[PDB]
Design a binder for this molecule. Structure first.
Ligand SMILES: COC1=C(OC)C(=O)C(C/C=C(\C)CC/C=C(\C)CC/C=C(\C)CC/C=C(/C)CC/C=C(\C)CC/C=C(\C)CC/C=C(\C)CC/C=C(/C)CCC=C(C)C)=C(C)C1=O
Ligand SMILES: CCCCCCCCCCCCCCCCCC(=O)OC[C@H](COP(=O)([O-])OCC[N+](C)(C)C)OC(=O)CCCCCCCCCCCCCCCCC
Ligand SMILES: CCCCCCCCCCCCCCCCCC(=O)OC[C@H](COP(=O)([O-])OCC[N+](C)(C)C)OC(=O)CCCCCCCCCCCCCCCCC
Ligand SMILES: CCCCCCCCCCCCCCCCCC(=O)OC[C@H](COP(=O)(O)OCCN)OC(=O)CCCCCCCCCCCCCCCCC
Ligand SMILES: CCCCCCCCCCCCCCCCCC(=O)OC[C@H](COP(=O)(O)OCCN)OC(=O)CCCCCCCCCCCCCCCCC
Ligand SMILES: NC(=O)C1=CN([C@@H]2O[C@H](COP(=O)(O)OP(=O)(O)OC[C@H]3O[C@@H](n4cnc5c(N)ncnc54)[C@H](OP(=O)(O)O)[C@@H]3O)[C@@H](O)[C@H]2O)C=CC1
Ligand code: SF4
Ligand code: SF4
Lengths: 157, 198, 385, 339, 92, 178, 315, 43
């Protein structure tokens, strides 16, 4: 089709596909939710298949899965690692400990949610959120990344 | 109803007397629970002496320190009840030596007797505030670096007084007095009816 | 010795460990591990909760050994009440107690290798783990964090058919352990990075309260499961895998050997589990069956009071220790006559082991520190509690 | 209304439901910060994709910040945003006339429609923000157009507060970063060699706090406050000072503006957010007006904060490893000019 | 020239990538061991040099002297290594 | 009963044959080649992964998953606000306030499960006398915003209506066990 | 034409370079009981292109640094690796150089800098150490790497890689000189920082990519993998000599294709199969285990020619 | 009555001991292979 609008819709569709297909997950491995993802990395529910690499250093990391309670001593760090991730970056909060305080909500040493520390994109629920459940959450991030229309907004801005 | 062998309640009882006799300067009470567990109670000054005798006595070798803890009975003048649980791999028995320490009356440290205590003693200071003299490096272990207050004290609020959030204006994490969105519902659970003479 | 603050670099993980260190080039002069990055209040929170609503905290204390931890609180609460679980429940707890040991060792051996750099053993055995989780789920409902072992026995009898599958798996798992072996036990390279690294003397291991494979690896013979039997671990027959020339490689071999010995204990439990009930019959301690609470008044009253108020344990205090996969896991549970506990210090095999990192990793390279954190199976949940 | 209950921090209530249309902005970010800290209900109309407004989510508490899709050309979007707000704050502004939005639109056209609807809605108060020293005859089209607006909106919304801030000093601001970023340029042009354009910066927060305080104070109605600052400056010291903290050479070389307006035209042609603007240039050399007016800061309750105090934080990113550890004390201060 | 043509394409391809990469998006660590290695490395690197002409020297009419020379060089350096081992060197 | 791992029973004195066998082990990396064979072997085994959207990892009836409030077949919501589901929740997640409905029946005006607070223990499933609150099978309820995770009576009742058919089948399969 | 012959010999290698990562993320997968990436595209063929586009779009953080090394270094790594394919004598070479192997040895040696420059350029004292590990090991392994080649050359007669096609017209140089092949293979594993010898990017953060993200990450990245191929290809010319028929030149390239892919497959297989060696364990191997073997076998290769009256024909 | 129990007569036996197979060519024989390659290769 012929319209500067159509070219700018198709090209983000391209840019969005690249970010969607290759999300490298940075996993703050707090508490036990990290295990329920080590199961996602494992053979029954491979994540690599979906382009999500097993582990990438913070500097190389498109997503941050915060698994486990964010205590008031690890908070100052999470923010640092979130702040040092490359710009295109997304956060997935896994576990009722991270999205909200979960058991340990009323503790004096637990931040009641990582949303207080880092902006959160998808909240995956469950005490050990099941591994498919994380995989559904990562797939929901991919649906959110498809919908984003950054080039369209710059054109009509 | 659990099976109970009185062989142990007799063996352990006797040992209790043996310890007491050998260390009468410090042993105040020595009891065996109905659960076959001995619990020599010692004056705080007997921390070093009573442990050492148990770590290095042929008839009572208690080589490893299972745990060092401090219950806090606020009513009790001496608030804390430091409890040391020890194991004897030689005689397959455990004993507990428990002392009493108030907030500003420190206890001696046993890092000398058992180096296992190097960490647990730091844990007791951080949570309850008891101080241990002659400790190699006493410093908060579990609480945050700037935490004010000793958390496991019965007089410390569960939620605490400070919580953390990221503030954009200052682009840095920042404490604020705790503001909770659903306070801990304090269900009263005690029933007005007792169960037995005990 | 330029402090590097390593460990917030997610390098050995097992949780989040700021191992501040001073390293003259690639040699470690002193390791001062920092802890509490996962302190969450588990010990204070329990004081405000009833005995049955504090059971889920124990699964979270060290969640790679989800259940074995629950057994320690169970035992402790049963002792205080002087109640014992029914015969079938005991065997169950030993059945899932062992399955859990395997789960922990598959975690410890394979995660050890991932830090070392071998990545294929983890994927090989995480598939077996997965299969085990499914046992948990089909027995408890949750893959991990079950809450199945409660203070008076198990919660619900095994599904009709689980035993058969805990057989098929067990019948084969061995080969899976065998494979890992053909990849690591004799690798010309595993040995090097592991052998003669973190040797701990026998006297020093008892002194620093190691109490686990770490002691057993140094040749001290102590398995709380044989020395002080809990549940029906007395009725089974297994061989403790003692070690000599204790070092990272020897202890490893010990953990692979308990994976082997646990299959021997699991087999028996399947061969000899009794017909019976899975929870004490004292409605006083165990909640009444739902058919009974919906047809009998005394059962509703007992259901209502148990769920709303609690056990009402008699006043006393006990330290009960089991042999959790990591080492001696003990709960010192002081209890007033109230339905909610007064204190519950959790002894974590791990608070003692980390402390030893300093006395183990001396004059060692950065890579050595990574190997030693692995040989202690540090789960920061139990250490931080 | 919403009776104010709580202790004062997050998870507390203050009773200010407020649409804030241009929150994504540098000033905005700060406005939502305090409003959220106080516990106010904040509705943030946004047009940029959700990815860019994430920075606003952690501010404010759950169910305290609501984001609505809105288009300036579409009147209906503004209509629903103010449906349930009782305070409307307008921070819509830009420096580069964009292809599809002219200075009139961003300053006068749009900010009118907005307050217009707000009245229809029955919002108790509207706060409109226009640049300082904004004559209907000022050289920069921007400033003049802004002036045009502050008039109009008064007819659409009478007794609508009109805070009129000076160029703002804050991290992520232009006033301070722009000059510091002249490093890339080997030479730093300064009209009249950076003289006779005395300037009085104002910390962003001060501005924000001031704005917020307006929302919660009956004294301000029809008031045209002017948040200014704690000290004025000839552009020379400012430029050098900046370069001073940045620890980068300062080479003040005068450039005839007539030619420089042309340089602004050049970058202005840039498709992606021109860095300098013809309208900017003029503004930069547009002298700060004197302080005889409804006072802003202090008058509205916040004591201004000197530039030197927080400059270190704004200009730190521009230093090199060599100077990173350097501190304010080591560096020298600039000099004010009561002139 | 043919090589020059290839190489400049090679740099161009890399500079192109980095440029797009930056444009499309729109204190005392010292151990003598480390220094010692570098040194040893050159002592060995120099020797590699004195050994590199050996392919042309094979065809030398002498042959006896060639090998007698080459064997002496390899042996004396290896002894250098030997003493490096014997000494704490090479023991990091 | 104990077992020595890594304890050499005796000192086998080197025999040339033995020495050669060993030296060959070091020189020609024989054991290293052994390890490569194992991985080549699996390369030929069928992979165990499942197409996640198309195929799903098996969960049996007791899986706790996502909270739902059931209703009687007639259409009367089962909960009668005894509020012991609130009493036994370990995390303080469930908040219940009630008042006698116009019919005169007991019912909950507000039932709010905070799922972020909930740790999915499944005791609420256990505690309910009418079994109104159940652990539903669905585990896929990940939400973009934190507020969506907080659930009031209407979401849970709606969750109950959507999954009632499977919840009924699951409770049908496991009630004899309980 | 010559330009066309530069596209071929470059693009083709770059496209193949992309397909190696894919055949790495699938062969490692099946070895570990997992399908690997098959969902993006058909059977994961579009997977390499996908991550490339993500990497370039992400912010080159340029994290505070010495800038012209944060940019020059990545370029050197790709430039040297793609450059070293210029002389490879797949059948006919492109630019036939009389001293060809010295070109390959020299060009490899220059890549050690990129590691040194990237490590100094980040401002993390950690990185400064990580680069040291690679730079030290690179030159170390280079010393045996070079001597192993000198032994080869003396049995080939010249430094030109083209001569070996005529040397290996009857038998591979593996039969003779197998003891060095192994030692060339292990050294090829070290110089491409692949697994058994991958201390870099090790526990440092599991070194000179620490601060490198997006476009810079990619360029080295690309470089490493192209090298992974090139070094394997040099094994497939120097030691495994593909059959050469002057009448049909492509069966040489067809077998070069087959042997290169299998030996490239081998270092993929090595990675999954072995744990990583310790830093000193690694140098202990080269200076203690291999260098004495190489220097002695070097002398045997100056003697084998003379007393077996087999001095190779120059030219 | 019907509860999940071991099948009558008990289950079969399960292997737990390591079954690593010592399968390989004898060392002398091995050396010969490589040596032979060199010996021939040289000729
Ligand atoms: C070590 O573990 C791993 C990682 O963690 C560091 C990875 O991130 C990754 C990275 C993931 C990948 C699939 C590889 C990334 C590969 C690339 C950047 C390929 C780039 C390809 C191209 C530029 C296409 C070819 C170019 C052209 C034709 C343009 C010519 C002008 C891998 C492979 C990995 O296994
Ligand atoms: C078809 C794919 C074949 C893959 C073969 C390797 C994987 C299968 C291994 C199976 C196994 O476990 O046995 C290993 C066996 C297992 O033996 P072991 O280690 O258990 O003990 C036997 C040896 N003794 C008893 C003396 C200690 O290892 C060997 O047999 C020796 C292997 C020597 C390898 C030497 C290095 C490799 C060869 C280098 C020279 C070049 C050869 C050709 C290279 C390619 C040319 C095109
Ligand atoms: C070609 C001739 C020889 C060039 C190298 C020898 C002489 C070097 C002179 C360096 C003078 C200082 C300098 O360039 O500063 C910039 C840099 C150092 O500073 P910098 O550029 O890293 O500083 C960055 C500052 N910000 C972030 C604000 C941009 O010089 C260097 O040391 C890096 C190389 C400089 C340019 C050399 C090009 C060589 C090309 C080879 C192909
Ligand atoms: C005339 C007589 C000739 C005698 C020849 C003897 C064999 C020639 C090669 C010997 C290499 C040197 C050696 O013996 O091994 C060194 C090292 C093992 O050393 P280690 O057992 O740890 O002993 C240390 C003692 N201080 O070896 C290693 O550890 C290597 C490190 C592991 C790297 C991966 C190893 C497996 C590779 C599998 C594929 C190999 C393919 C080789 C051929 C490829 C095609 C050319
Ligand atoms: C990036 C930095 C590294 C650049 C890549 C590495 C290039 C290495 C070149 C080594 C020398 C090559 C050579 O000697 O070939 C010479 C060639 C043919 O000569 P010859 O082999 O003797 O054959 C004669 C009869 N056929 O004929 C010639 O005379 C070629 C003359 C030299 C060709 C060099 C090609 C450009 C390489 C330099 C680029 C400089 C710009 C980058 C500077 C980087 C600085 C760090
Ligand atoms: N130095 C300063 O900053 C000074 C500012 N002011 C005034 O304060 C106000 C805020 O300034 P500041 O935050 O720096 O401005 P910004 O450049 O940061 O933009 C402010 C907001 O306005 C929105 N906006 C701009 N154009 C349009 C449009 N056509 N349609 C819809 N929304 C639009 C932007 O949203 P998006 O980015 O999503 O388009 C942005 O969130 C301005 O209006 C300005 O006149 C006055 C004096 C000094
Ligand atoms: S959420 Fe449940 S599982 Fe995840 S960490 Fe908190 S407790 Fe452990
Ligand atoms: S228990 Fe069942 S019925 Fe009683 S309130 Fe909670 S949900 Fe409603």
């Amino acid at each position: 089709r012929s319209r500067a609008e159509y070219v700018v819709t198709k090209l983000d569709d391209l840019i969005n596909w690249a970010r969607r297909s290759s999300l490298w997950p940075m996993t703050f491995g707090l508490a036990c939710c990290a295990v329920e993802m080590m199961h996602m990395a494992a053979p029954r529910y491979d994540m690599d298949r979906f382009g999500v690499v097993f582990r990438a250093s913070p500097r190389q990391a498109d997503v941050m899965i915060v698994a486990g309670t964010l205590t008031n001593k690890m908070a100052p760090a999470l923010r640092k690692v979130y702040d040092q991730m490359p710009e295109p970056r997304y956060v997935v909060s896994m576990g009722s400990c991270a999205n909200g305080g979960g058991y340990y909500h009323y503790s004096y040493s637990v931040v009641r949610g990582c949303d207080r520390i880092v902006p959160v994109d998808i909240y995956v629920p469950g005490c050990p959120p099941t591994a498919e459940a994380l995989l559904y959450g990562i797939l929901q991030l991919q649906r959110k990344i498809k919908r984003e229309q950054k080039l369209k907004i710059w054109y009509r801005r | 109803v659990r099976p109970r062998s009185d062989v142990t309640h007799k063996q352990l009882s006797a040992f209790g007397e043996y310890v007491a006799e050998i260390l009468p300067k410090y042993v105040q009470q020595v009891q065996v629970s109905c659960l076959d567990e001995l619990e020599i109670c010692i004056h705080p000054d007997g921390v070093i002496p009573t442990l050492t005798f148990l770590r290095d006595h042929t008839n009572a070798q208690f080589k490893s320190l299972a745990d060092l803890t401090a219950v806090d009975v606020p009513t009790r003048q001496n608030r804390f009840e430091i409890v040391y649980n020890l194991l004897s791999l030689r005689f397959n028995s455990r004993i507990r030596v428990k002392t009493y320490a108030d907030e500003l009356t420190p206890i001696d440290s046993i890092v000398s007797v058992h180096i296992a205590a190097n960490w647990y003693e730091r844990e007791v200071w951080d949570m309850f505030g008891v101080f241990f003299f002659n400790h190699p490096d006493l410093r908060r272990i579990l609480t945050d670096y700037g935490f004010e207050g000793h958390p496991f004290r019965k007089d410390f609020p569960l939620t605490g007084y400070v919580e953390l959030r990221y503030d954009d204006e200052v682009k840095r994490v920042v404490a604020e007095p705790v503001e909770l969105a659903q306070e801990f519902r304090k269900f009263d659970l005690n029933s007005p009816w007792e169960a037995f003479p005990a | 010795n330029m402090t590097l603050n390593f460990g917030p670099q997610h390098p050995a993980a097992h949780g989040v460990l700021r191992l501040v260190l001073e390293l003259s080039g690639e040699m470690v002069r002193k390791c001062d591990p920092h802890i509490g990055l996962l302190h969450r209040g588990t010990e204070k929170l329990i004081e405000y909760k009833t005995y049955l609503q504090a059971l889920p905290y124990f699964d979270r204390l060290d969640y790679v050994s989800m259940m074995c931890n629950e057994q320690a609180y169970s035992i402790a609460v049963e002792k205080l009440l002087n109640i014992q679980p029914p015969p079938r429940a005991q065997w169950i707890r030993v059945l899932f107690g062992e399955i859990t040991r395997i789960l922990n060792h598959i975690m410890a051996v394979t995660t050890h290798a991932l830090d070392i750099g071998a990545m294929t053993p983890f994927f090989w055995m995480f598939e077996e783990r997965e299969k085990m989780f499914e046992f948990y789920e089909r027995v408890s409902g949750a893959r991990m964090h079950a809450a199945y072992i409660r203070p008076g026995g198990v919660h619900q009898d095994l599904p009709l058919g689980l035993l058969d599958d805990i057989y098929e798996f067990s019948k084969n798992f061995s080969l899976r352990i065998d494979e890992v072996e053909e990849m690591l036990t004799n690798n010309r390279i595993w040995r090097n990075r592991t052998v003669d690294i973190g040797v701990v003397t026998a006297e020093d291991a008892l002194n620093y309260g190691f109490s686990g494979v770490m002691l057993r690896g140094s040749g001290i013979q102590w398995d709380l499961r044989k020395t002080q039997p809990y549940d029906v671990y007395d009725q089974v027959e297994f061989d403790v895998p003692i070690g000599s020339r204790g070092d990272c490689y020897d202890r490893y071999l010990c953990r692979v050997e308990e994976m082997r010995q646990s299959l021997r204990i699991i087999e028996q439990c399947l061969n000899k589990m009794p017909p019976g009930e899975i929870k004490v019959d004292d409605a006083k301690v165990s909640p009444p069956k739902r058919a009974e609470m919906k047809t009998s008044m005394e059962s509703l009253i007992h259901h209502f009071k148990l769920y709303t108020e609690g056990y009402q344990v008699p006043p006393g205090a006990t330290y009960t220790a089991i042999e959790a996969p990591k080492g001696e896991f003990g709960v010192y549970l002081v209890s007033d006559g109230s339905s909610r506990p007064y204190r519950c210090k959790i002894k974590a095999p791990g608070f003692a082991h980390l402390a030893g990192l300093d006395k183990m990793s001396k004059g060692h390279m950065l890579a050595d520190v990574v190997a030693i954190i692995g040989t202690q199976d540090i789960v920061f949940g139990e250490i931080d509690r | 209304a919403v009776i104010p209950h709580g202790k004062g921090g997050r998870s507390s209530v203050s009773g200010v439901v407020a649409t804030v249309f241009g929150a994504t902005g540098f000033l905005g970010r700060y406005v939502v910060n305090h409003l959220g800290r106080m516990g106010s209900q904040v509705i943030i109309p946004y047009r940029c994709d959700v990815y860019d407004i994430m920075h606003l989510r952690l501010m404010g508490d759950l169910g305290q910040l609501t984001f609505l899709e809105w288009d300036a050309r579409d009147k209906d979007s503004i209509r629903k945003a103010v449906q349930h707000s009782n305070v409307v704050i307008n921070l819509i502004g830009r420096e580069w006339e964009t292809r599809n939005f002219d200075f009139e639109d961003v300053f006068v056209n749009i900010p009118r429609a907005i307050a217009q609807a707000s009245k229809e809605a029955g919002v108790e108060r509207f706060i409109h923000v226009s640049h300082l020293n904004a004559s209907m005859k000022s050289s920069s089209k921007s400033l003049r157009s802004k002036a045009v607006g502050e008039k109009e909106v008064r007819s659409v919304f009478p007794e609508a507060i009109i805070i009129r801030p000076s160029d703002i000093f804050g991290r992520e601001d232009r006033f301070l970063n722009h000059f510091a970023n002249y490093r890339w340029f080997l030479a730093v042009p300064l009209v009249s060699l950076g003289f006779k354009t005395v300037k009085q910066p104002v910390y962003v927060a001060d501005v924000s706090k001031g704005i917020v305080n307006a929302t919660k104070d009956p004294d301000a109605v029809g008031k045209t406050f002017a948040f200014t600052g704690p000290n004025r400056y000839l552009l020379f010291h400012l430029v050098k000072y900046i370069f001073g903290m940045t620890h980068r050479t300062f080479i003040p070389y005068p450039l005839p503006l007539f030619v420089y307006s042309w340089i602004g035209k050049l970058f202005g042609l840039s498709p992606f957010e021109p860095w300098t603007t013809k309208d900017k240039v003029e503004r930069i050399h547009i002298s700060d007006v004197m302080p005889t007016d409804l006072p802003g800061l202090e008058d509205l309750g916040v004591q201004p904060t000197p530039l030197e105090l927080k400059s270190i934080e704004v200009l730190r990113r521009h230093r090199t490893y060599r100077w990173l550890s350097s501190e304010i004390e080591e560096t020298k201060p600039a000099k004010t000019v009561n002139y | 020239m043919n090589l020059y043509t290839v190489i400049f394409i090679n740099i161009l391809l890399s500079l192109t990538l980095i440029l797009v990469a930056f444009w499309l998006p729109q204190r005392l660590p010292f151990s003598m061991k480390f220094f010692l290695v570098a040194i040893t490395f050159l002592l060995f690197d120099l020797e590699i040099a004195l050994l590199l002409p050996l392919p042309w020297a094979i065809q030398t009419i002498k042959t006896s002297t060639m090998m007698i020379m080459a064997f002496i060089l390899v042996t004396i350096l290896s002894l250098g290594l030997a003493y490096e081992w014997t000494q704490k060197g090479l023991e990091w | 009963t104990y077992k020595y791992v890594n304890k050499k029973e005796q000192e086998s004195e080197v025999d040339m044959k033995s020495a050669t066998d060993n030296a060959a082990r070091i020189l020609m990396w024989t054991e290293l080649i052994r390890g490569l064979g194992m991985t080549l072997s699996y390369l030929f085994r069928e992979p165990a992964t499942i197409n996640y959207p198309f195929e799903k990892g098996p969960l049996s009836p007791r899986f706790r998953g996502e909270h739902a409030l059931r209703r009687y077949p007639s259409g009367e919501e089962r909960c009668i606000a005894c509020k012991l589901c609130e009493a036994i929740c370990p995390a303080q997640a469930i908040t219940i306030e009630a008042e006698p409905r116009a019919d005169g029946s007991r019912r909950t005006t507000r039932y709010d499960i905070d799922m972020t607070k909930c740790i999915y223990c499944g005791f609420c499933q256990e505690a309910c006398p009418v079994d109104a609150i159940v652990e539903g099978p669905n585990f896929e309820f990940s939400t973009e915003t934190h507020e969506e995770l907080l659930y009031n009576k209407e979401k849970l009742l709606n969750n109950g209506d959507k999954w009632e058919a499977e919840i009924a089948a699951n409770i049908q399969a496991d009630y004899l066990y309980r | 034409m010559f330009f066309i012959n530069i596209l071929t010999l470059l693009v083709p290698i770059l496209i193949a370079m992309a397909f190696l990562t894919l055949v790495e993320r699938k062969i490692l997968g099946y070895m570990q009981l997992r399908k690997g990436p098959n969902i993006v595209g058909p059977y994961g063929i579009l997977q390499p292109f996908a991550d490339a586009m993500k990497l370039f779009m992400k912010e080159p953080m340029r994290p505070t640094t010495s800038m012209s090394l944060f940019i020059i270094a990545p370029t050197l790594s790709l430039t040297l690796a793609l450059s070293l394919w210029v002389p490879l004598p797949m059948p006919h070479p492109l630019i036939n150089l009389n001293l060809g192997i010295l070109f390959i040895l020299a060009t490899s040696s220059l890549s050690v800098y990129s590691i040194l420059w990237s490590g100094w350029a980040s401002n993390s004292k950690y990185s400064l150490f990580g680069a040291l590990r690679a730079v030290a090991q690179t030159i170390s392994y280079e010393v045996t790497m070079a001597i192993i080649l000198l032994s080869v050359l003396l049995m080939n007669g010249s430094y030109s890689l083209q001569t070996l096609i005529t040397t290996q017209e009857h038998m591979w140089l593996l039969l003779p000189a197998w003891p060095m092949a192994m030692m060339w293979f292990i050294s090829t594993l070290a110089e491409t920082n692949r697994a058994p010898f991958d201390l870099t990017e090790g526990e440092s953060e599991l070194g000179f990519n620490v601060e490198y993200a997006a476009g810079p990450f990619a360029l080295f990245f690309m470089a490493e993998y192209t090298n992974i191929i090139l070094m394997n290809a040099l094994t497939t010319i120097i030691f495994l000599g593909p059959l050469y028929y002057i009448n049909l030149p492509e069966l040489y390239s067809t077998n070069f294709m087959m042997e290169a892919l299998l030996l490239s497959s081998t270092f993929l297989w090595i990675r999954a199969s072995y744990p990583r060696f310790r830093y000193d364990q690694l140098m202990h191997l080269l200076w203690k285990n291999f260098l004495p073997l190489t220097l002695a076998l070097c002398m045997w290769h100056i003697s084998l020619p003379i007393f077996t009256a087999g001095v190779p024909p120059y030219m | 009555v019907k509860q999940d129990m071991p099948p009558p007569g008990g289950y079969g036996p399960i292997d737990y001991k390591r079954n690593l197979p010592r399968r390989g060519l004898s060392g002398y024989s091995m050396f010969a292979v490589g040596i032979g390659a060199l010996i021939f290769g040289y000729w």
